[PDB]
Amino acid sequence: TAIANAAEKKAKAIDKIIGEWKLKVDDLAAELDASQKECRNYSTELFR
Amino acid sequence: TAIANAAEKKAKAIDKIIGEWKLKVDDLAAELDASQKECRNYSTELFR
Numbered sequence A, B: 001t002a003i004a005n006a007a008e009k010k011a012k013a014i015d016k017i018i019g020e021w022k023l024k025v026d027d028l029a030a031e032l033d034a035s036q037k038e039c040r041n042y043s044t045e046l047f048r
Helices: A001-046 B002-017 B024-047
Strands: none
Touching: A001 B002, A001 B024
C-alpha cells in the first residue's frame, strides 16, 4: 500500500505540470515555421 | 498487489513521457537557433 500512496501523490501532482509543456511545444512550434517562412522568402529574393 | 503494480505502470510512464517532451523542446530549440542562423546569414547577403 505504501508504494501506492507514494505513487499517486507524485503522479496526480505531475500531470498539472504536463499541461504547460504541452503548451510550450505548441508555443515553440510557431517560431519554427515562422522562421521556415522567413528562411525561404529571403532566398527566393536573394536568388532573384 | 494489483493496484501497486498497476500504479507504477502509470507512474513510470509519466516519468518518461515528460522526457519525451524534455528532449522535444531542446531538440526543437537546437533545431531553431541552428536554422535561424542560416536564416540570418542569407539576410546579410541580401543587403550587400
